Symmetry: D2
Subunit: 252 residues, 4 copies
């Protein structure tokens, strides 16, 4: 019951971190609208979780987002929290292998998709003194090799989170982000499978953290529920969920 | 029950932020040892809260700290979380008004007191896979006018928190800090009373945050319970509880 | 002679910060290619400065950028430093007043324009062990009111700078950025003129810094010459040229 | 001639980074007072460099510092820049191997020594609109394994630098710090010699940077001359001279 009576929209909620966030909020008593552009994960989740329902929505299609918000209000009567988790990490690409076209496409998903849902949802979040939680990345703050476009998209997300927190603070709407590090998800697993030695890549990924393992979507979920339900003097913050990857010297 | 069965030591727990942290952990099901060098607040708190008990301890006196830890283990049989909240902010002092003697005294309380309890407690925290939470300050990261020694003490706390998180991560002991901003406490109130216009000073303190108010000890308490009970992939982090004071342009 | 024999491209070099950067590099002995999409400032600068020449180039038009690089090499035979200063700050806009269309347009100038020149120039910078300097902003790191799209563009620039520094470090190409704060430029002056009380807005802008004044383009120029000529163990850094605006408490 | 006519005090200037800083400032036209508690390096440097002279001074002995400042003024008639470089890094020590006594001793050198010279010098720096440059460390911001006391001392230095920049900005005195990473110095070499495999330790130290080498004292010197002579809109900043060690993922 930490977030009972509340209504939460999670984008990219059908698998991975989003699915962990969906589960965290349901376990806290909220009703959750799972947004995802693929049917498979989200529809199963909705069958599994009383209190979660699934609405197909591609966050890069404005009308989809418009319909997502209006369906949430029509079905549930309020909107308290928006979690902008939908995003993608391309495979490793050297700078000269990137293109301005792929860059823009990544910006559409990772940055503009977050911007659009937030914009359409803020009128309802103002009425509920709700809050916005963006899922960014540690590599927006510290960089990453072979990921110029992706790093750039997360740099904008973290900064935009602080700018929005300024604009919306007079209206009681808090805006925060979570910067996860290595989190074991289908995306991390997909990228590993494209490496020459997948198990070497995964073992390297675990050791990149002092804690010696990768994170779990459930641990990002717990951070998200904290930001929504118990962090009322927190706005514009970047909550690091990284196992300490940013600390200390390493092999670069 | 988020931290049921756990044993927590909070220093400076008799009033202010510490008292908020004590209450947060009791409400989460932990048993709490209130450490404080003044009897008044802590003994009242212990009478008020089933599950909290009070042990007089001056964190700058090593033998007091030694006895604090041994009493906690003898009475409760385990130690899961140490909250190093005991600390002090001197009144405003221009650089030339400070002295190397007052600086050292402040370092004894704000930095070495935290170091000593952490050192004596870590053997028990290793057995319990417990965690350490230091209460630092936003002004360690961004500075503050007329507070060179105080800012320095909190700079060391935040950095030490990251160094300790590195050393202790192989042993499963997480080490994090909270950086509060303006939190309305007896200390904030005492400092205001020394200003020519106390109500002007307090009104200025509220507006230094975009949220337009100061924080409450209970909100630092919620952040502390989160770090202890739900943040298992978080180590070496600095959790900002500031109402957004670090964001954006202001009058300097 | 600190950068004698070197060839520098400065975008947005016809006025403002860019013009200060152009002048700084000419004074250091480099030859400078002034890139700008307006003729007026840059052509005057080229007449004024032996060693600086002007090439019309809109950094959002790829073929313009392609021609800019090929003209620089054809005329000067090498390329050592690229300064991505071309950028724009829209007038104040509340979040709900922004659009996804204006956002993309701003991303084209502030982020993709920087990306394109850097990409086309890196092959020549690799041959010369040259370096890249992006002009970002303090408000990418700390946010700003009524500037969600602009803040986002600078968030991506700072992050991209770190990602590129990683990719290019094995090839001896350093990549850094400068984050200016309030710098008195025609852009700052234009924005002030749209305020109800322009002189109030400017006076507020000066006081937002502890130093009590805004910065000068020449001071950003000095920082840029330092990064190019003397900072060979610096890569991926964010050099703050802000008069201390990010320090301490203020009125928010 | 970038700093001609100016008078600079460098502590710990007899070898290592300090010696690089001394040489940088002499090459810029300043007269330099080499402060060091060992005679050997500093006296040789003074014989070698016209414009540099050597004064024996232990920065932890207040009367030594008092005499250092009065000798500088008596001999040279002004004081423009103070570089607080004297400091020490203990050998690797696990947390439980440290003591509150060694911690205090380290604080005396790394933090209080910097504080004392700065205090005694500020009256003269105010008359000259001079500036203060503290040599801190990257590991104050990101931590380091087996160096709790050392990391803490540098955490306080960086924070104190920002607090002092606030207090002194109304008086025209800028206060900045440099955070070097791995710099090849006699201290780095001494620590390596205590490792089981010294050449393995050094090779590991080079690879901890994306640039693939350690830094040179001359590169810290160049950063210091920049902060003194050309960075007049910079105060309270932390100039990273690290070869990019803080960027990206590594082996932790
Ligand atoms: N280590 C990590 O995996 C890691 C670290 C830092 C940040 N992140 C971020 O966490 C978020 C989730 O990543 P993940 O690892 O869970 O990935 P994932 O690939 O496992 O899941 C992402 C989900 O988003 C959905 N999605 C993708 N594009 C969408 C669109 N246009 N509209 C709607 N839904 C869309 C996908 O269908 C999928 O269900 C992303 O923003 C990612 O950048 C991940
Ligand atoms: N705005 C704020 O008040 C604020 C902001 C940032 C950080 N902090 C930090 O929060 C912590 C608590 O501050 P507060 O505002 O609650 O202050 P407070 O003065 O209201 O309470 C501090 C408590 O610590 C106790 N204490 C002091 N010295 C001690 C010692 N040597 N041994 C044991 N106990 C000791 C006092 O008796 C008191 O009960 C401090 O570390 C402070 O620096 C406060
Ligand atoms: N306080 C400040 O003014 C401040 C602070 C932080 C960052 N910045 C950044 O500094 C840079 C310069 O800003 P300024 O204040 O000097 O502005 P400015 O408006 O005075 O000058 C910018 C110049 O860039 C040119 N330009 C614009 N769009 C271009 C394009 N598509 N192609 C080529 N040239 C183009 C303009 O013609 C102009 O000459 C920008 O990136 C800005 O965001 C400025
Ligand atoms: N990689 C690095 O070596 C590195 C990285 C970051 C920061 N730093 C900092 O750079 C500074 C210089 O380090 P270094 O590597 O050049 O070390 P170093 O040991 O080679 O030289 C330090 C000098 O300071 C002098 N000194 C020591 N204690 C003193 C005292 N009490 N009074 C006066 N002089 C004293 C010594 O005699 C010596 O000449 C230190 O503050 C250190 O923490 C070094
Ligand atoms: O596998 N990924 O998609 C991934 C790994 C680490 C990150 F920090 C990140 O943003 C994304
Ligand atoms: O009132 N104080 O003691 C106080 C106020 C603000 C801070 F950030 C702080 O560390 C302490
Ligand atoms: O006036 N400007 O365009 C302006 C002012 C301050 C900033 F930090 C900035 O990026 C832009
Ligand atoms: O060898 N050292 O003393 C050393 C190495 C790296 C650091 F960042 C440092 O502060 C000190
Ligand atoms: Na359901
Ligand atoms: Na009790
Ligand atoms: Na010319
Ligand atoms: Na000499």
């Amino acid at each position: 019951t930490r977030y009972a009576g509340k209504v939460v929209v999670v984008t990219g909620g059908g698998r991975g971190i989003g699915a962990g966030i969906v589960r965290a909020f349901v376990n806290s008593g909220a009703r959750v609208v799972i947004c995802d552009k693929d049917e498979s994960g989200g529809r199963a989740l909705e069958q599994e979780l009383p209190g979660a329902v699934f609405i197909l929505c591609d966050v890069t299609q404005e009308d989809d987002v418009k319909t997502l918000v209006s369906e949430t209000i029509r079905r549930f009567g309020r909107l308290d929290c928006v979690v902008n988790n939908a995003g993608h990490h391309p495979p490793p690409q050297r700078p000269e292998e990137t293109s301005a076209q792929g860059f823009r496409q990544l910006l559409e998903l990772n940055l503009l998709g977050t911007y659009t849902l937030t914009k359409l949802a803020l009128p309802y979040l103002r009425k509920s003194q709700g809050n916005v939680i963006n899922i960014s990345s540690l590599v927006g703050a510290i960089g990453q090799a072979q990921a110029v476009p992706y790093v750039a998209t997360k740099g904008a997300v973290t900064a935009m989170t602080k700018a929005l927190a300024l604009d919306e603070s007079p209206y009681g709407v808090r805006v925060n982000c979570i910067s996860p590090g290595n989190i074991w998800t289908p995306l991390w697993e997909e990228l590993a499978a494209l490496m020459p030695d997948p198990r070497a890549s995964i073992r390297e990924g675990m050791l990149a953290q002092p804690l010696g393992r990768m994170g779990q979507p459930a641990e990002v979920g717990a951070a998200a529920v904290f930001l929504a339900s118990e962090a009322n003097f927190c706005t514009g913050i970047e909550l690091l969920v990284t196992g300490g990857a940013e600390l200390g010297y390493g092999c670069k």
